[PDB]
Motif scaffolding. Structure first.
Motif, PDB file in Angstrom:
ATOM      1  N   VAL A 166     -11.971 -11.564 -11.467  1.00  0.00           N
ATOM      2  CA  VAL A 166     -11.281 -10.558 -11.630  1.00  0.00           C
ATOM      3  C   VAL A 166      -9.667 -11.321 -11.555  1.00  0.00           C
ATOM      4  CG1 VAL A 166      -9.566  -8.874 -10.487  1.00  0.00           C
ATOM      5  CG2 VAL A 166     -11.890  -8.713 -10.203  1.00  0.00           C
ATOM      6  N   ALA A 167      -9.586 -12.323 -10.974  1.00  0.00           N
ATOM      7  CA  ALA A 167      -8.504 -13.394 -11.235  1.00  0.00           C
ATOM      8  C   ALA A 167      -8.388 -14.279 -12.375  1.00  0.00           C
ATOM      9  CB  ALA A 167      -8.322 -14.362 -10.007  1.00  0.00           C
ATOM     10  N   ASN A 168      -9.431 -14.696 -12.887  1.00  0.00           N
ATOM     11  CA  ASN A 168      -9.687 -15.687 -13.957  1.00  0.00           C
ATOM     12  C   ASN A 168      -9.412 -14.653 -15.106  1.00  0.00           C
ATOM     13  OD1 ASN A 168     -10.510 -18.112 -12.663  1.00  0.00           O
ATOM     14  ND2 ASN A 168     -12.546 -17.517 -13.184  1.00  0.00           N
ATOM     15  N   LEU A 169      -9.793 -13.482 -15.210  1.00  0.00           N
ATOM     16  CA  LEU A 169      -9.692 -12.788 -16.300  1.00  0.00           C
ATOM     17  C   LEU A 169      -8.238 -12.061 -16.540  1.00  0.00           C
ATOM     18  CD1 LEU A 169     -12.294 -12.797 -18.026  1.00  0.00           C
ATOM     19  CD2 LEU A 169     -13.036 -10.953 -16.346  1.00  0.00           C
ATOM     20  N   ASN A 170      -7.363 -11.963 -15.371  1.00  0.00           N
ATOM     21  CA  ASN A 170      -6.045 -11.622 -15.378  1.00  0.00           C
ATOM     22  C   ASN A 170      -5.109 -12.697 -15.712  1.00  0.00           C
ATOM     23  OD1 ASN A 170      -4.944  -8.739 -14.571  1.00  0.00           O
ATOM     24  ND2 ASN A 170      -6.769  -8.990 -13.197  1.00  0.00           N
ATOM     25  N   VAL A 171      -5.690 -13.701 -15.616  1.00  0.00           N
ATOM     26  CA  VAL A 171      -4.903 -15.145 -16.054  1.00  0.00           C
ATOM     27  C   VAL A 171      -5.165 -15.333 -17.257  1.00  0.00           C
ATOM     28  CG1 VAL A 171      -4.668 -17.689 -15.756  1.00  0.00           C
ATOM     29  CG2 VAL A 171      -4.822 -16.080 -13.758  1.00  0.00           C
ATOM     30  N   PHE A 172      -6.427 -15.183 -17.885  1.00  0.00           N
ATOM     31  CA  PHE A 172      -6.919 -15.430 -19.454  1.00  0.00           C
ATOM     32  C   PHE A 172      -6.251 -14.270 -20.254  1.00  0.00           C
ATOM     33  CE2 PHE A 172     -10.288 -15.072 -22.295  1.00  0.00           C
ATOM     34  CZ  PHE A 172     -10.022 -16.278 -23.180  1.00  0.00           C
ATOM     35  N   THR A 173      -5.918 -13.311 -19.907  1.00  0.00           N
ATOM     36  CA  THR A 173      -5.321 -12.037 -20.438  1.00  0.00           C
ATOM     37  C   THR A 173      -4.003 -12.246 -20.812  1.00  0.00           C
ATOM     38  OG1 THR A 173      -6.593  -9.822 -20.165  1.00  0.00           O
ATOM     39  CG2 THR A 173      -4.487  -9.994 -19.303  1.00  0.00           C
ATOM     40  N   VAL A 174      -3.304 -12.944 -19.963  1.00  0.00           N
ATOM     41  CA  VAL A 174      -1.825 -13.399 -20.072  1.00  0.00           C
ATOM     42  C   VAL A 174      -1.738 -14.365 -21.010  1.00  0.00           C
ATOM     43  CG1 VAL A 174       0.289 -14.408 -18.823  1.00  0.00           C
ATOM     44  CG2 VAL A 174      -1.028 -12.208 -18.003  1.00  0.00           C
ATOM     45  N   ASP A 202      -5.174  -9.837 -30.722  1.00  0.00           N
ATOM     46  CA  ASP A 202      -5.004  -8.370 -30.268  1.00  0.00           C
ATOM     47  C   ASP A 202      -6.440  -7.731 -29.643  1.00  0.00           C
ATOM     48  OD1 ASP A 202      -2.450  -7.850 -30.200  1.00  0.00           O
ATOM     49  OD2 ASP A 202      -2.159  -7.182 -32.185  1.00  0.00           O
ATOM     50  N   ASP A 203      -7.529  -8.313 -30.547  1.00  0.00           N
ATOM     51  CA  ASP A 203      -8.850  -7.771 -30.255  1.00  0.00           C
ATOM     52  C   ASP A 203      -9.318  -8.498 -28.951  1.00  0.00           C
ATOM     53  OD1 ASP A 203      -8.847  -6.127 -32.516  1.00  0.00           O
ATOM     54  OD2 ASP A 203      -9.808  -7.581 -33.990  1.00  0.00           O
ATOM     55  N   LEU A 204      -9.051  -9.726 -28.830  1.00  0.00           N
ATOM     56  CA  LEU A 204      -9.433 -10.549 -27.514  1.00  0.00           C
ATOM     57  C   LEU A 204      -8.982  -9.954 -26.314  1.00  0.00           C
ATOM     58  CD1 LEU A 204     -11.970 -12.789 -27.938  1.00  0.00           C
ATOM     59  CD2 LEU A 204      -9.928 -14.090 -28.660  1.00  0.00           C
ATOM     60  N   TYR A 205      -7.501  -9.396 -26.347  1.00  0.00           N
ATOM     61  CA  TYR A 205      -6.833  -8.904 -25.319  1.00  0.00           C
ATOM     62  C   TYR A 205      -7.643  -7.500 -24.916  1.00  0.00           C
ATOM     63  CZ  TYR A 205      -3.012  -7.842 -22.398  1.00  0.00           C
ATOM     64  OH  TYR A 205      -2.312  -7.506 -21.068  1.00  0.00           O
ATOM     65  N   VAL A 239     -10.596 -21.969 -26.722  1.00  0.00           N
ATOM     66  CA  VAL A 239     -12.074 -22.206 -26.557  1.00  0.00           C
ATOM     67  C   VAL A 239     -12.154 -23.022 -25.013  1.00  0.00           C
ATOM     68  CG1 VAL A 239     -13.636 -23.871 -27.432  1.00  0.00           C
ATOM     69  CG2 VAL A 239     -12.287 -22.824 -29.097  1.00  0.00           C
ATOM     70  N   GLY A 240     -11.697 -23.873 -24.649  1.00  0.00           N
ATOM     71  CA  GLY A 240     -11.717 -24.489 -23.319  1.00  0.00           C
ATOM     72  C   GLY A 240     -12.027 -23.431 -22.367  1.00  0.00           C
ATOM     73  N   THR A 241     -11.236 -22.382 -22.324  1.00  0.00           N
ATOM     74  CA  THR A 241     -11.205 -21.402 -21.111  1.00  0.00           C
ATOM     75  C   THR A 241     -12.453 -20.430 -21.578  1.00  0.00           C
ATOM     76  OG1 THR A 241      -8.938 -21.461 -20.998  1.00  0.00           O
ATOM     77  CG2 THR A 241      -9.930 -19.615 -20.338  1.00  0.00           C
ATOM     78  N   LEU A 242     -12.773 -20.372 -22.567  1.00  0.00           N
ATOM     79  CA  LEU A 242     -14.033 -19.550 -22.829  1.00  0.00           C
ATOM     80  C   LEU A 242     -15.184 -20.287 -22.332  1.00  0.00           C
ATOM     81  CD1 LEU A 242     -13.336 -18.020 -26.263  1.00  0.00           C
ATOM     82  CD2 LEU A 242     -13.569 -16.610 -24.473  1.00  0.00           C
ATOM     83  N   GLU A 243     -15.178 -21.670 -22.748  1.00  0.00           N
ATOM     84  CA  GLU A 243     -16.138 -22.418 -22.207  1.00  0.00           C
ATOM     85  C   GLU A 243     -16.421 -22.422 -20.430  1.00  0.00           C
ATOM     86  OE1 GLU A 243     -15.274 -26.052 -24.410  1.00  0.00           O
ATOM     87  OE2 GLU A 243     -16.779 -25.236 -25.585  1.00  0.00           O
ATOM     88  N   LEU A 244     -15.341 -22.375 -19.825  1.00  0.00           N
ATOM     89  CA  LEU A 244     -15.160 -22.108 -18.524  1.00  0.00           C
ATOM     90  C   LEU A 244     -15.582 -20.876 -17.952  1.00  0.00           C
ATOM     91  CD1 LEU A 244     -12.205 -23.151 -16.268  1.00  0.00           C
ATOM     92  CD2 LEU A 244     -13.196 -20.933 -15.931  1.00  0.00           C
ATOM     93  N   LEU A 245     -15.340 -19.606 -18.383  1.00  0.00           N
ATOM     94  CA  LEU A 245     -15.934 -18.418 -18.335  1.00  0.00           C
ATOM     95  C   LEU A 245     -17.480 -18.250 -18.647  1.00  0.00           C
ATOM     96  CD1 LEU A 245     -13.101 -16.096 -19.610  1.00  0.00           C
ATOM     97  CD2 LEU A 245     -13.343 -16.654 -17.340  1.00  0.00           C
TER      98      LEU A 245
END
Lengths: 150, 150, 150, 150, 150, 150, 150, 150, 150, 150, 150, 150
Positions: free
Chosen positions: C11-19, C41-44, C97-103
């Protein structure tokens, strides 16, 4: 040739072309990956729909469409090659353009043939297809920085 | 065979099958022409999308999709033959169903493989495709007077 | 970690990624601004959808989702930095990409943990999301001129 | 009690649950009449769709669904009672929620059983159904002023 | 102040508000759970689009939007707290209405400022959100048995 | 029987009929599997909606609708039987038509009865239902090679 | 200049701009052909609607819109040149951007004029157009690798 | 009376009813504010269309519809009062219900009168409106904790 | 003998043909009732459309279309007969296919005639209609178990 | 003239016509204001589309479209005149009809020229545009009280 | 006066106008019946939205809307008359234009009133309404053959 | 005459009337060409549906619909005449109104006969058609400047 033989030949060509478009979509890389990828989805559908229209029209004048990969491969004049050496986006589009030009020039032969056989329906079908191909040619040439007949 | 090899193998299979669906549609005759015609367009699209998802999943795990007719022929377990002597609506649905059964059982192998290699996504994808094949198998067997597994 | 903790951590990670996706959108420049703008916009939308499902799944197994910016900052492993000195469209995409790889890698840990604890629903949820994250890494790496697993 | 008999048991349950959704909808009184009436409409549809997918899945693995009121009555574990004494909306939502609880716990048994039998498709279908039920259980529990597991 | 600072200040407020709307949604309990949750979903979308439009307007006038959770917390006057002690529906709605009140009043401040600096577009943008906010205030205070400005 | 008893009686009938429609959908085999399958999907939802309207009208005149399988079975004149021997598609359609005629003839009784009691709304409702029933009778008799009333 | 002559001056401006947008669409080449092509269709439609609204508002206050290519040419401040020397994608968009800048500054003068006259509707219409032009300016400038007001 | 005066009498009533639906919607307070607000919008639309239909039917049979607030007030059996003292949702909802009962009871008179006079179209139109009115009485009575007739 | 004469002849033909499409829909019996019935609805619309386009084209070239049943009957070459003796589904479709072949061949004449008179628009309208006719001749011949040019 | 210069000449003509349609709409008065307004909106959009296809086709055969108001006025045979004096509905529409007639006549020359040059695609585009023009002349003349060739 | 009384006053005006638009519709005769009755349907809906928005804005600022026919009559400056003597379409339209002109001029006063009170939201709303009123005044005066301001 | 012969008589009438609506559409001239042209479209599909419903109802009470031009001509009471000499829009609309009046009066005989025979469905269907016809009679009578019944 005759009209039946012509349409069947295009059945094969179009099934080879359609698989090539998937090849380009699956293997493309670079800054235009999203925009050009969705362009290939659209192209895939349209060329699938022309293929259906060719087959169903051939059915309607009393012919018998090619209906195996083996028969497509044995009768297509459109060429394919497996993907091995990395190919640039420009080189994939150049391959695409090459094929559209090949289909443009063979449809023009079908248009003449089909006027001489007095098959008014098939004639008109082939001209509408050429109209779309000619517009695709201009756009992909424009993408490649070139004029349509350059 | 590893997960990459299974998936590429299915890319080839699906391209043979898709062209087979067109054969059944082009050459079907009899009282059910209209209602199985529409069902074949529906199957054409559904398996077309399956083939796309299989290729993109292979891409996404580092693999390289087969992308020509010649490659699909060289690697497919699904068989094709040219349409020469007339066939009944039942005979065409039985080839259809026989090919569905082949895919079902091979997807089952892919499901086990992919579970042992710990590839949860490809595993999930293969199952959902199977659920659909199982349902189509029940429906086309009912059309031919038969129980699904019988 | 138990399932509730793992879910709350995302929940935390995704609220950070979203921003972070808005940051990329708002500040991006260069020839790919329109196509990458629409893609942000689609990813958001899509990752806020995940986030919502994650919290709703946590609520339904009896947990208590984090629900403040401060709680998200306290609990996230996805990192952010304020935008100061220009970065290029490759630099922002490599951060993406780095952040997608972490998720992906963390979701894989959540999948395993959820299997061990017999929670079939959360397991299935997480796998479905990893299918989409995997697709996005392939696509976004093809945009950057590279293979999916680099 | 194997996969076929578990699926058949739920066909009977879901037909009893469906008619209990109508009973609540028809007899409800109180300030929440409009928003919970609309809730019962959505639930009626959703649970009628589970029922269908369950009966279609049983057909697809070679079974024979119960197909009479009499048969649903001999076999359902879900309980029903005639509406003789009026009840509050809270008491109706307790009966609702108690039935969703029964179905969740039962689907849990079918999930474990269908994993033991290697029926991957029925397994995956039942998990998806369990996810929706768990969401409704959180929500209707919230409507009653309680936590999901309480 | 000046216009850019005022806009940024609201980028930070709206991000905190939006996370608070989610908070109220996730934790609410009681007879109004369904209708009010629905309304929180609408408010969540509406205030997130308000935030994009604030940020894009800031971009359009040469500004740099806050684009981290850290920066939003540092600049927001909108207050957040973790959910611990249980709260009524009413108590949650009184928080929501008090935050709406606070944004209304900072917007009136912003409208006057932007009038005096001669930024016509930003002035108009802010007047339109105050219309929506004022509407929500009347509606949510009515839900609470109160006049809009008592 | 007065108006309320008559309506209640059809709530019971329609719940039995709705389950019989499903039995026919599920167990049907042969060349019309696809086209007749979709027709029972349409009939299923049409007759479900008749039932909802009968019930709500019983409510609106001060009645209390039967609301359990046990009451439906205890009160219905429409017959059901477990599916034990496979039947022809024709035989299943003869059971459908047979049931439609029963409902037609009984509604004719409800229409006279409700005219006699001066209840004009219920009279109207029942006449619109008969119209649709009379049309289903023609069409399914036509499917069986017969005229509507022989 | 009064409001009438201002609005009429923009009828002419808008008619030249709109033909310029077509010039850019038709003669563009390079890798951004596809993304910018669609952007020019959108800008074409949006600026043709601006012009309708400008002309209709001029008609409603009793003015008389220019209505020939000749008059548009004699009164427009927006400039056009025929396409001869090849131009880059970049040069074309700078023409586009400079022209949007011209329109923004002229509308800012119409907003002052129109406020001084007490014409509140025209003032409001002009402020909405400026909002959209400014957003367009940030966006096309960002495509060009620059900040909005550089 | 006769049919033309009856229809005109209801043109007046419905215009007094529709302003009352707005009054109820404008002054409503309490926890049901959102859900009952929406039902008031639907009733307003529905009762507005019923009015246009009555007036246009009146026209079709050669009559002259009342068409002023002065004539509506002079002819209506429906009562209105200004909103001065506070009133609960229940009290608001009971004026709503009392008004539907009056319209029901008068439509019943109009139904009987239209039967005697042989105007089969007006007779059917009035019966359809009473079906909806009867259904609304059931639902709003149920919202109040009451049986429809008692 | 000239374009106007020919077009008017087809106005007569298409109105007879249309009423024949209705005769077939109304009287058909047998297992294909539902699927052929829908097919007649579609043919009914599509030949009604064709008729209007023929009428509008005649009008566009200075003609006066036939506009009475008497005129259609005196001028039509398509034949009709009252349905008296029972006909098989096949027998009805042979009459359809037969009428289609008559229109195909007559349209062929109109195509050569309009070529020689230089009416390019009417020529092209006729070619498009024959394309659709040729396809329906194929599909219906295939329903009958037969090659299209039998 | 060749194909390329014919097409460019029509780019010029179509940009003058389109602007004249606006002149007609903007300066319309009388009982026909709403019906003719609507019809002019439709004609503007249609002739706008026609123009893009003329331009795009010219692009596809290696030409270079005129792309300024200046070149349009230098090259066009369609005439324009400023609205310095009020004109009747009839004068405005007679102008409309006469401009349509010129376009028909010139397209007829282009159809002959493209046929003679063996440009099948352009020939066909031009014939479809004539079909529509001929149909607008019939309709707009019927509106003025006259036959199509009067 | 003050903003609250000006808003209530218009709630009364709009209610009188809405009923007046119905009178025009119902009693209207002559060649313009269809072309103008459709425009009366739009005007009805539109001034119905307006009246809602006024009422809700009044509520949002702490006001209490008039909500009875009696109160609307006591307070309105828009005048109504019953239809007795027949009227031209001209006469009914002139009374329409006259009433829109009154509304325009009273909204101009509300706009000023609301500027001097600092009510930025109410001001903007009133401007948006006057925009549409100005347009309607121009279009209906054009229909009668008069310029907007004579 | 009985219910069967009445319905069959209207199958004949409706086919003549529908072709008369085409005659009106095709030959109309004058200022209502467009707006009435579209009304003839709506009327054409509306009486086309009425005809299909009459034929299908006749089918469903065991009858045999007339189904050729010759039969419709022999049986109809609706008159037709070829369009020779020129007719005003009003004269055309009087022919239309006179035919609608005839259908109304005949449908009223069918309403009575069908009440005497206890055929409630056919009775209700005919009343619904009269309801529409009466509405059309008022609108077209009003177009002509007349009262519905005069």
């Amino acid at each position: 040739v005759d009209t039946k033989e012509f349409l069947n030949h295009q059945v094969a060509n179009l099934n080879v072309f359609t698989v090539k478009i998937h090849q380009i979509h699956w293997y493309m890389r670079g800054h235009n990956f999203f925009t050009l990828g969705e362009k290939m989805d659209d192209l895939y559908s349209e060329f699938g729909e022309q293929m259906d229209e060719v087959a169903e029209r051939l059915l309607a004048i009393g012919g018998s469409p090619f209906s195996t990969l083996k028969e497509f491969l044995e009768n297509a004049s459109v060429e394919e090659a497996p993907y091995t050496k990395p190919k640039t986006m420009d080189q994939l589009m150049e391959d695409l353009v090459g094929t559209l030009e090949l289909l443009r020039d063979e449809y023009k032969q079908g248009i003449e043939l089909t006027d001489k056989e007095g098959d008014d329906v098939t004639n008109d079908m082939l001209i509408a297809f050429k109209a779309s191909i000619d517009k695709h040619i201009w756009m992909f040439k424009a993408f490649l920085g070139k004029a349509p007949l350059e």
